[PDB]
Structure formats: structure tokens, C-alpha cells
């Protein structure tokens, strides 16, 4: 799961038997060896400098990974290998359905393109970042599967809407702090009024609120949440212009003069986390690539 | 590593004992499986065994249960497992063995945060086997070497230090991607 | 007049960690290849031109390639003529390594 989309992992035993000749380059050119026999002898004794060469000629040299029971066009794909410790090839989980590969025990064949033209073909035509759509109807081929899907569903699951959040009806004319004046005890637990996303994440880190605990978040953008014909449940109106409107999931405080900026959204930290993840991923890829 | 109920597996990682979830008595977990495998293959019989194993490990007793015990009663295996779990939780004061709100499950903690995973997790002591298809019997690698007398190709498999074969569908993929040099050099060079 | 001038322009902070994982994952090269191919009509011609330019690079200055991956060299050369710093041959370093090899997960 730690591998990037443009990367695979090759065992140390497999790599030395595929890039042997390029390592012979690395030894001869760098003047750490003299003859072909001497270089091969140094290779056969597993010298500590051998892996420095077979970590240096593999950076930028793509390898074609092929699933033995090939079924579709995406059964063979190019990857940028890295040296891993063990005896198994580490594969990215998103491309697995592209290979239709599970992990109950399966075998993958590696091939090395030698020609410079072949390396250009492998890098510029068979990498899993320009083949993200299937040729059948044009539907995504790398989408979050079972575990990631469950994680995202649990993240964006919301709070408990109605009778599952309150034992008694909230009509219940009581607890008004009732007297002839509004000078009484004022707790009004209500829900937190966080400034923005990062304030909400920070307050969640302190374990002040849970994942599905509702909260109010100020909105400084246009309307993004998918609404419909809808109806405002209750719009309060003071004798002075206040336009207190309460919709199904957001609150708008307009006025009679100016500055309609009081948009508040009822949400949970999971939706904030997902939106922040997507937004910062975009704004990080944009600035990383200049 | 495979169980007795068709739940096979490939070992992916090996963690230090301080980096694994621990029960409410501090014992680190020895193996972590994927729950989603149960609804797919539809083998609930492992779960029972899992829970039952725990009871044995906490009572110094072994069970030899004949199959189809649902003839004496209705849901007899449930009665057996839950009664054994309650007896193990009562004789040895371990109130996490039989939680009387989600029986068979318990709330384990995180080995690298000291936090309880939000939902209770099924734990047990199943009987896991080790299979003969070992990885060291499946690795391969070949830069050059022996060639066949007639066809002049790498011989075969691993004993003869052969090379992996590409044919039919594989070529159809390479033609699909529109790569000509790659396909050319897998037949000539 | 339109009151969205800065609400859509406030800088997103905490982006420093979402600037690095792009750089060792090959994300910069992947996002540069498509921008180079954003104007090409036929991708096969572009690939063949890149391969021929890399072959010329290998021929003219043979005794340098084997590490530099001349295809990366020509890609960096093409990306470096319109800004887009793109260090030479997309070479990766180990700034903090008093050792020979990283574990690589």
C-alpha cells in the first residue's frame, strides 16, 4: 500500500539476474573492476558495492510486469522498479483489478526492455497513469476497491439523523430556562462553531469531538453541496432586518442592508477530511509540477 | 499459511511485537486476517472455531466436536460457543472474553497509538497450517545461458534456467498498446 | 465588483508535505509527460521523436550514460526551455544518507 501508482518492487535476487549486464557496466566504467571475469566474480560473491550498482542502473529503467494468466489489454503494464528486501514482488493495490490479481498466491513475470526505443515505448505508452480508462465503454479501471471503499464510506457516513440521536422528542416544552426575563443559566451546548476546516481537524485531534459528531462550519465560498427544489424549514424574522433562515442542512443570516456572508453548514469531520484531502491533493500536484 | 476452512493467505508483512494490536490483557495479536473474506467465500464456520479456540486456551481443555450438531437443538453451535466463552470468562476473571453486548467480540487497542479501535473485533485461537508452496521454490532470474539445440530459445522453467514465455494474448496486448519495438525485441533479440 | 476575488484565491496551507510525495513517486515526470504531450497530435510520433533524440544523445556523448538515462535527459531538456526547472536528467539524490542503500519500504 505504500507504493506510488508509477512504481513496483523487485526482489534483490530477481533484480541481480535481470540487470546483471548493466551492473557489469557500472563496475567496469566506474573503474571498480577491470575485466569481465573479474566483474562477474565480484558479482558472484555478493559484495556490498554490487547493490549500489544495482540500485543505480535501475533508476529510470522501466520493467514490464505481466500476469501469467493474461485476460485483457491491461494484463501487461510498465513500472519503475525499486529494490525491496525479501523474495516477493510488491504490487500496487489499485492496479490489481487491472491485473485481476488477488493475493492468495499468484505469479508475475518481469521483462526488461533493452533498446532505447523500447524503453521509450515502455515509459511513454504503458504506464498506469495514462491508461486509467478501459476501452470497453470508457469507464474508470482504477477505483477504490473493497477496503478503501469501506474506509471512504465510513468517513462520509454522517451523524444519526432523528430518533437514533435523541431518546425524547425535542418539542418537549421544557428546559427553556423559563422565566419572565432572558437572564437565566445559559449553557446551550448546541454544536461547535469552527472557523474553517483546519480548526475542525485540530479540535478532532484533541478528541474533543468524534468523527460523526455534528458541527457548524462557516462557509466562505459559493454553494457546493448538491441541493434541490427543497424548502427552508423555518425562517425566523426579527422586528429588525435579520432574515434568520434555517434550511434542511445549512443556515443563512441575511439582512436589509448588506453583507450576506453568514452561511453555516452542518457537517461532520469526515466530510471535511475528505474534501480537504482532495483539495490539498490537487493544490499540491499543481505546485509540485510548477 | 492456510486455515482449515479454505481461508488461504500470503504473508505480506512481519511486525515487531510492540507494533501489533493487543487485547485488554496486553497480549499482542499473533496474526491479522481480513474480515471481508468471510462474506465472499461464505465460510462462517471459521468464526465459531475462532471463538471456541479462545475458550480452550483459557480453560486447558480441548474440544472434539462431531459435525452437524444442529440435530439435538436449534442453533446448538451458538449455545456451545457462547457457554464455553462465558465459562472461560467467569472461571478466569477476564470480563472481555464474553462481552454481554456483542458476544464473541471485544475491543482491542492499537499497538502504535494506545487507542481503542472504534468497533469491537472478533478474536480467537484458530489452528493455522503452513503450506508447501514456498516462495524460495518460485523465484526466478536469467540474463543469458543455455539455449535449445533446435529452436535456440531458453530451455524451460527453473531447473533448466529457462526464460518466461510470451505468446498469443500477451502479443495481443502489446499490439493493443501500439508498441512495436518492445514486441519486435521479444522475438528477435 | 464580483465579491469572490479572494475567497477563491486564499492560499491553501499545510501543502509542504503534499509537495514531496509527488517527487519520489515519479509524479513530477508523470505530470510533465502529459504537459509535453498536451499539444502533440499523434503520440506515437512524439515517442519516436523522443527515442531518436535519445539515440543521438547516446551517440554524441557516449561515456556519460548508464546512470543518467538519456531519455530522462531529453525529457528534462524539453521541459527546461519554458521555465519548469526540472533538475538535469531528473536525477535523484540522498541528502541524508550516511549509508549505502535505503530500505525502500
Amino acid at each position: 500500500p505504500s507504493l506510488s501508482l508509477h512504481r513496483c518492487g523487485l526482489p534483490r535476487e530477481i533484480a541481480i539476474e535481470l540487470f546483471q549486464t548493466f551492473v557489469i557496466r557500472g563496475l567496469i566504467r566506474q573503474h571498480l573492476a577491470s575485466n569481465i571475469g573479474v566483474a562477474k566474480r565480484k558479482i558472484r560473491e555478493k559484495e556490498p558495492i554490487v547493490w549500489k550498482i544495482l540500485q543505480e542502473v535501475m533508476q529510470g529503467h522501466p520493467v514490464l510486469l505481466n500476469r501469467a494468466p493474461t485476460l485483457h489489454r491491461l494484463g501487461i503494464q510498465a513500472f519503475q522498479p525499486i529494490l525491496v528486501e525479501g523474495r516477493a514482488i510488491c504490487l500496487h493495490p489499485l492496479v490489481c483489478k487491472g491485473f485481476n490479481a488477488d493475493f492468495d498466491g499468484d505469479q508475475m513475470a518481469v521483462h526488461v526492455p533493452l533498446s532505447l526505443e523500447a524503453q521509450a515505448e515502455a515509459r511513454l505508452l504503458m504506464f498506469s497513469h495514462m491508461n486509467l480508462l478501459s476501452p470497453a465503454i470508457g469507464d474508470p479501471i482504477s477505483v477504490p476497491t473493497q477496503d478503501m471503499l469501506i474506509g471512504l464510506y465510513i468517513l462520509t457516513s454522517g451523524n444519526r439523523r432523528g430518533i437514533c440521536a435523541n431518546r425524547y422528542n425535542p418539542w418537549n416544552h421544557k428546559t427553556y430556562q423559563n422565566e419572565r426575563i432572558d437572564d437565566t443559566n445559559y449553557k446551550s451546548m448546541k454544536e461547535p462553531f469552527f472557523c474553517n476546516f483546519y480548526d475542525a481537524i485540530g479540535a478532532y485531534r484533541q478528541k474533543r469531538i468524534h468523527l460523526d459528531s455534528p458541527l457548524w462550519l462557516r462557509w466562505q465560498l459559493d454553494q457546493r453541496i448538491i441541493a434541490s427544489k427543497e424548502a427552508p424549514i423555518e425562517v425566523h424574522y426579527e422586528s429588525l432586518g435579520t432574515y434568520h433562515e434555517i434550511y434542511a442542512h445549512y443556515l443563512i443570516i441575511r439582512s436589509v442592508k448588506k453583507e450576506i456572508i453568514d452561511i453555516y453548514i452542518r457537517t461532520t469531520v469526515g466530510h471535511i477530511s475528505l474534501y480537504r484531502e482532495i483539495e490539498e491533493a490537487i493544490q499540491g500536484f499543481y505546485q509540485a509540477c510548477s | 499459511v492456510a486455515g482449515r476452512h479454505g481461508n488461504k493467505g500470503i504473508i505480506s508483512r512481519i511486525l515487531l511485537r510492540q507494533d501489533m494490536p493487543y487485547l485488554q490483557d496486553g497480549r499482542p495479536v499473533d496474526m491479522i486476517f481480513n474480515p471481508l473474506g468471510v462474506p465472499s467465500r461464505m465460510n462462517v464456520g471459521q468464526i465459531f472455531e475462532c471463538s471456541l479456540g479462545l475458550a480452550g486456551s483459557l480453560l486447558d481443555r480441548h474440544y472434539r466436536i462431531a459435525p452437524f450438531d444442529e440435530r439435538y437443538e436449534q442453533e446448538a453451535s451458538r449455545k456451545l460457543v457462547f457457554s464455553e466463552l462465558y465459562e472461560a470468562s467467569k472461571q478466569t476473571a477476564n470480563p472481555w472474553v464474553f462481552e454481554p453486548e456483542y458476544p464473541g467480540k471485544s475491543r482491542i487497542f492499537d499497538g502504535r497509538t494506545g487507542d481503542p479501535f472504534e468497533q469491537p473485533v472478533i478474536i480467537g485461537n484458530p489452528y493455522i497450517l503452513k503450506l508447501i508452496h514456498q516462495v524460495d521454490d518460485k523465484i526466478h532470474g536469467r540474463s543469458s545461458g543455455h539455449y535449445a539445440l533446435v529452436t535456440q530459445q531458453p530451455l524451460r522453467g527453473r531447473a533448466k534456467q529457462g526464460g518466461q514465455r510470451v505468446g498469443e494474448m500477451e502479443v495481443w496486448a502489446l499490439e493493443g498498446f501500439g508498441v512495436a519495438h518492445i514486441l519486435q525485441e521479444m522475438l528477435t533479440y | 465588483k464580483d465579491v469572490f476575488m479572494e475567497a477563491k484565491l486564499e492560499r491553501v496551507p499545510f501543502l509542504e508535505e503534499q509537495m514531496r510525495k509527488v517527487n519520489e513517486g515519479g509524479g513530477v515526470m508523470a505530470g510533465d509527460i502529459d504537459r509535453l504531450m498536451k499539444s502533440e497530435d499523434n503520440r506515437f510520433a512524439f515517442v519516436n521523436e523522443i527515442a531518436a533524440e535519445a539515440t543521438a544523445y547516446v551517440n554524441n556523448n557516449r561515456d556519460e550514460y548508464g546512470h543518467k538515462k538519456a531519455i530522462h535527459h531529453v525529457l528534462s531538456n524539453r521541459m527546461n526551455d519554458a521555465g519548469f526547472a526540472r533538475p538535469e536528467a531528473y536525477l535523484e539524490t540522498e541528502p541524508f544518507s550516511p549509508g549505502p542503500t535505503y530500505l525502500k519500504e
Binding site: 526505443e117 | 512495436a180 | 519516436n48 527515442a51
Partner: peptide
């Protein structure tokens, strides 16, 4: 890529 082939002037 084996359709036409490169020329380079």
C-alpha cells in the same frame, strides 16, 4: 510506433 518511422530532415 511502427506505422511510419522517423526521418529527421
Amino acid at each position: 510506433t511502427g506505422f511510419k518511422g522517423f526521418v529527421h530532415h
